[PDB]
């Protein structure tokens, strides 16, 4: 129905630091015949579930340093790949990808797997989407680990969540240009530019899902959706503000990647004010947008903060 293609398995034979077994679902309501991949690590009967959402243009691979820390703490860790990325299937038309297409997949996943006592772990698009999930079924959500992310609201309600789109020229403007313009988009090259500490092998793990441009439509549409917010996106994200400010009563841990030109402190401090009970943020000076690249530390510190309240 949705025309999609699947990455050949051999593309992932040689991954670095990614020893996690695949789990796939292909009978999700609303996503007929599309196979989604997800990691399910740690004790499957655990009381606490860490739901780790990735962003643009990555995959669950991004969480490889944090997963073991969480699993070791006794928790179950779920890390899905959105349709268009990782080992999940990839719709070939950019038009198939929408804010709701991705948000509905998440609600579908959550129900099918019946996740409860969720500690939401988000960054980038994983956060633009993820922060809009709790208001749909608050009982399943208990904690939040937020890294460089915000809400896709309109410019008037929260100017901080729109300002970055236009300035600086080497921030969001550069990012989007790098992603949507090349006819021969090399993800490994893009990653090394935006996450300067990745090794060559790590960089290649980010290119692994895309043999050629035909597998990259999802990659291409995410940046455009930051630039062009549809009405459902705006309404849903606006209504999420209310949730975090008045309704949220869980534990929160915030980490900021200080070198991020996109969603740094000028986006994060404002986000901190909107989240009821958000504590002082953990500022990681050497980290850029991909906070997860300095993840072991974020994971360990968050667990310590949360334990310091049990």
Curated annotation (Swiss-Prot):
Domain of life per record: Bacteria
Keywords: Detoxification, Hydrolase
InterPro entries from the UniProt entry: AB_hydrolase_1, AB_hydrolase_fold, Epox_hydrolase-like, Haloalkane_dehalogenase, Haloalkane_dehalogenase_1
Notes on activation and inhibition: Inhibited by thiol reagents such as p-chloromercuribenzoate and iodoacetamide.
pH profile: Optimum pH is 8.2.
Every AB hydrolase-1 domain range: 49-295
Active site: 124, 260, 289
Gene3D superfamilies: alpha/beta hydrolase (3.40.50.1820)
Pfam families hit by this protein: Abhydrolase_1
Catalyzed reactions: 1-haloalkane + H2O = a halide anion + a primary alcohol + H(+); 1,2-dichloroethane + H2O = 2-chloroethanol + chloride + H(+)
A GO molecular-function descriptor: epoxide hydrolase activity
Pathway: Xenobiotic degradation; 1,2-dichloroethane degradation; glycolate from 1,2-dichloroethane: step 1/4
GO biological process, one term: response to toxic substance
Coiled coil regions, renumbered to chain: none
Family as reported in the entry's similarity comment: Belongs to the haloalkane dehalogenase family. Type 1 subfamily.
Task of the protein: Catalyzes hydrolytic cleavage of carbon-halogen bonds in halogenated aliphatic compounds, leading to the formation of the corresponding primary alcohols, halide ions and protons. Has a broad substrate specificity, which includes terminally mono- and di- chlorinated and brominated alkanes (up to C4 only). The highest activity was found with 1,2-dichloroethane, 1,3-dichloropropane, and 1,2-dibromoethane.
Designated name of the protein: Haloalkane dehalogenase
Gene: dhlA
């Amino acid at each position: 129905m949705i025309n999609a293609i699947r990455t050949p398995d051999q593309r992932f034979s040689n991954l670095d630091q990614y020893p996690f077994s695949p789990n796939y679902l292909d009978d999700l309501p609303g996503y007929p015949g599309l196979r989604a991949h997800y990691l399910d690590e740690g004790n499957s009967d655990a009381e606490d579930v860490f739901l780790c959402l990735h962003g643009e243009p990555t995959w669950s691979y991004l969480y490889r340093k944090m997963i073991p820390v969480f699993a070791e703490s006794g928790a179950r860790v779920i890390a899905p790949d959105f349709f268009g990325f990782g080992k999940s299937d990839k719709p070939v038309d950019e038009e198939d990808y929408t804010f709701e297409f991705h948000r509905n997949f998440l609600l579908a996943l959550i129900e099918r797997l019946d996740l409860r006592n969720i500690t939401l772990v988000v960054q980038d698009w994983g956060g633009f989407l993820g922060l809009t999930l709790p208001m749909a079924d608050p009982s399943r959500f208990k904690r939040l680990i937020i890294m460089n992310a915000c809400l896709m609201t309109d410019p008037v309600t929260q100017p901080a969540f729109s300002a970055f789109v236009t300035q600086p020229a080497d921030g969001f403007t550069a990012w989007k240009y790098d992603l949507v313009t090349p006819s021969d988009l090399r993800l490994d090259q893009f990653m090394k530019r935006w996450a300067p500490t990745l090794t060559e092998a790590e960089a290649s793990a980010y290119a692994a899902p895309f043999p050629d441009t035909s597998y990259q439509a999802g990659v291409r549409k995410f940046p455009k959706m930051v630039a062009q917010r549809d009405q459902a996106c705006i309404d849903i994200s606006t209504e999420a503000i209310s949730f975090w400010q008045n309704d949220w009563n869980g534990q929160t841990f915030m980490a900021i990647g200080m070198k991020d030109k996109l969603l740094g402190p000028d986006v994060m401090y404002p986000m901190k004010a909107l989240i009821n009970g958000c504590p002082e943020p953990l500022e990681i000076a050497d980290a850029g947008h991909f906070v997860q690249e300095f993840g072991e530390q974020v994971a360990r510190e968050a667990l310590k903060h949360f334990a310091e309240t049990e």
